[PDB]
Design a protein around this ligand. Sequence first.
Ligand SMILES: N[C@H](CCC(=O)N[C@@H](CS)C(=O)NCC(=O)O)C(=O)O
Ligand SMILES: N[C@H](CCC(=O)N[C@@H](CS)C(=O)NCC(=O)O)C(=O)O
Ligand SMILES: C=C(CC)C(=O)c1ccc(OCC(=O)O)c(Cl)c1Cl
Ligand SMILES: C=C(CC)C(=O)c1ccc(OCC(=O)O)c(Cl)c1Cl
Ligand SMILES: [Ca+2]
Ligand SMILES: [Ca+2]
Ligand SMILES: [Ca+2]
Ligand SMILES: [Ca+2]
Ligand SMILES: [Ca+2]
Ligand SMILES: [Ca+2]
Lengths: 209, 209
Amino acid sequence: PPYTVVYFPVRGRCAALRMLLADQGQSWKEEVVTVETWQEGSLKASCLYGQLPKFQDGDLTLYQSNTILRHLGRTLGLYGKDQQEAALVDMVNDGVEDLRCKYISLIVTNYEAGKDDYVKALPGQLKPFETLLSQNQGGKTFIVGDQISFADYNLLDLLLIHEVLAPGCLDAFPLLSAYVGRLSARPKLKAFLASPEYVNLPINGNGKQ
Amino acid sequence: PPYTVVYFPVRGRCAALRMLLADQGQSWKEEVVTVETWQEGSLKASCLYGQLPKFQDGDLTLYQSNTILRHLGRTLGLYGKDQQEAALVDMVNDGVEDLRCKYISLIVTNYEAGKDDYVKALPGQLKPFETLLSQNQGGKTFIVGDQISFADYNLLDLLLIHEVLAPGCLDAFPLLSAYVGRLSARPKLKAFLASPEYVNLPINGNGKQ
Ligand SMILES: N[C@H](CCC(=O)N[C@@H](CS)C(=O)NCC(=O)O)C(=O)O
Ligand SMILES: N[C@H](CCC(=O)N[C@@H](CS)C(=O)NCC(=O)O)C(=O)O
Ligand SMILES: C=C(CC)C(=O)c1ccc(OCC(=O)O)c(Cl)c1Cl
Ligand SMILES: C=C(CC)C(=O)c1ccc(OCC(=O)O)c(Cl)c1Cl
Ligand SMILES: [Ca+2]
Ligand SMILES: [Ca+2]
Ligand SMILES: [Ca+2]
Ligand SMILES: [Ca+2]
Ligand SMILES: [Ca+2]
Ligand SMILES: [Ca+2]
């Protein structure tokens, strides 16, 4: 620290890392980039891959939302107990990323025509995470092992936004459903999720969810 | 170990982890899945996310190409010298993955109509990695720090397939151009890249490159 998040005024790809920081009792600054500022081009030209989020951790500048999550995971001890658990954490996170990419593609490029197909496909996309829970202490703790990892925050966000996209998509998955409630009830995360800094942001940039 | 790679008969998303293993003096088994076996459904239904590669490391079963890379990076010590370098390695790898996804989309969904636009955009997509090299010991070592990392193998693969797609795309990037020659000349990697194991597989599954 100090931590600074540089992003558009949306939840988007910063939603998980923010929940992680909040739940872990961390402070951070939000630096907001508007569409009009971004379009000027100067900040963009300055970004490693021409994209946001950009994250500052003291004198470390990072790009890439999953790099930020892994960095915070490593430095705050949210990466499993073992090298083997570490591997499982990554496997979960990469799964979350794949589905997030499909979600973003729908939202940004094909919402109206694509939604029906996406929703029909959704149970089979959610099922792997229910299966992972079923294989770890009866679904009663976390996605990997017996402590929270960065993948938990990422998966929680993915599940939250899919309940907005498709209300009741978790009803067929008792472990995922209970998991969402149990993690959302963690006191620091509960407060953050109720706070204007979360509540008063849209999920995406184009008005769709 | 022992290591097993379960994949289609292509370089694809196993190309980097295979270079990594060969370069590190590791042996592994290739278990080949044909289009016909895959279409039968049994193996696919058994895969965590319904996809390949699948990787065995002794009694550990992994899915997700970047999970496998990070696992090998972690267990073989190809993950930077400290936590800050680990973050930089992830940042590189996540950048490589974004471009790989764009490349795969071109190849699979839009080769004929998309190639011109893709190739025009290519220098802007390659420049960040030239910049990273320029910022690390004048480009003379590795993408991050002074030791090879899993992201080096993934980046080298990305550069190799783009030279096939767009011959001469690296001519404007002297550090990237030299980096490709230098890593490819590493003795164990050199031998692997010249071997039937590599040479006799197509890059992708649809006859395009
Ligand atoms: N690989 C992604 C990239 C982030 C990304 O897609 N950024 C978008 C908003 S979430 C963006 O900056 N688009 C603006 C532009 O490309 O000009 C990550 O995980 O951070
Ligand atoms: N997230 C990817 C996914 C792998 C993937 O897209 N697999 C393709 C071949 S490279 C596949 O198994 N397609 C068959 C199918 O979906 O049925 C990874 O990094 O491993
Ligand atoms: C957040 C996104 C997906 C999670 C995204 O793709 C995105 C892209 C461009 C954006 O504006 C900048 C512009 O000039 O359009 C905004 Cl606000 C967003 Cl949210
Ligand atoms: C990444 C890929 C290549 C650029 C890819 O998606 C892919 C998908 C299906 C495939 O066949 C199996 C089948 O019958 O679907 C194969 Cl061989 C590949 Cl390589
Ligand atoms: Ca704050
Ligand atoms: Ca912990
Ligand atoms: Ca319910
Ligand atoms: Ca029901
Ligand atoms: Ca090393
Ligand atoms: Ca040249």
